């Protein structure tokens, strides 16, 4: 029988021991520019969120880049998404509350063959 | 201004903006590997692994003049800390391969 730290009723205790909360591999990498389905990043700052740096990707093109560097629109650039947890800080007044949230991040794009439909 | 090292949260996880066959249709295809951890929330995480070193060309064959590379993302997970305790957690940062993209070996001019 092992001891547990005290947790107030109807709560969850969260230890945030992460050093460099906003450190991202996307900063030094340039695969977003080298990709056949290239993408852009939009970076926003939210001081009431952990992590505070909000990074979203957007596909640059409809189609995919070929050998010549030209768009082949018979192929699709599609965004790929990842679910993550965030901590949101809420203020009523000077009173502060914290909550866990699940968010979706568009991390980049890939090049896929299209799904084809027919009329009849 | 900064978030404290330790916070109390309520029992509700608020879903924001949440809710396919790309792993096969992509010119940089990948395989998904299951990572299960009962001490972790989410307990199951799917990890992408690029199927080839090269990319698929117009003919459907592997072109090694292009590369399949992972798109990796830093995500936050919950780890029960101490492991046997139900309501105390460590917010843990992990690097996950979400999928793969096709890249030219250098940025082209
Ligand atoms: C994607 O972003 C471009 C902006 O150019 C980027 O600049 C650098 C940061 C680098 O990453 C480059 O490779 C990128 O191309 C957007 O293009 C601009 O759009 C404005 C209109 O809003 C236009 O006036 C500018 O001339 C454009 N600049 C360039 C260089 O093209 C582009 O619209 C973004 N695409 C999407 C879909 O959001």
Numbering used by the authors:
A (entry chain F): 44 to 163
B (entry chain A): 39 to 57, 64 to 153
Sentences copied from the publication:
IL-17A and IL-17F are highly pro-inflammatory, “signature cytokines” of effector T helper 17 (Th17) cells, a distinct lineage of CD4+ T helper cells of the adaptive immune system that appears to play an important role in clearing pathogens not adequately handled by the Th1 or Th2 immune response. All IL-17 family members (IL-17A, B, C, D, E and F) are homodimeric glycoproteins with a cystine-knot-like fold that lacks one of the canonical disulfides found in bona fide cystine-knot proteins such as TGF-β, bone morphogenetic proteins (BMPs) and nerve growth factors (NGFs), among others. Here we present X-ray and site-directed mutagenesis data on human IL-17A/F that provide first detailed insights into the molecular architecture and receptor recognition properties of this heterodimeric IL-17 cytokine.
We produced the full-length human IL-17A/F heterodimer with an APP-tag (EFRHDS) at the N-terminus of the F-chain by co-expression in HEK293 cells, and isolated the heterodimer from the respective homodimers by two successive affinity chromatography steps using anti-tag and anti-IL-17A antibodies. Tetragonal crystals containing one heterodimer in the asymmetric unit and diffracting to 2.3 Å were obtained at pH 7.0, and the structure was solved by molecular replacement. The two polypeptide chains are associated in a head-to-head, parallel fashion, as in the parent homodimeric cytokines. Asn83 of the F-chain carries glycosylation while there is no detectable glycosylation of the A-chain at the predicted site (Asn68). In IL-17A/F, one of the expected two inter-chain disulfides (Cys129A-Cys47F) is well-defined and its assignment agrees with published mass spectrometry data. The dimer interface of IL-17A/F is very large (total buried surface ≈ 5448 Å2) and engages approximately 55% of all amino-acid residues. In the free IL-17A/F structure reported here, the flexible coil of the F-subunit is fully ordered and runs across the pocket entrance, hence fully masking Site 2 on this side of the heterodimer. In sharp contrast, the flexible coil of the A chain is partly disordered and runs along the second β-hairpin of the F chain, leaving Site 2 on the other side of the cytokine well accessible to bulk solvent.
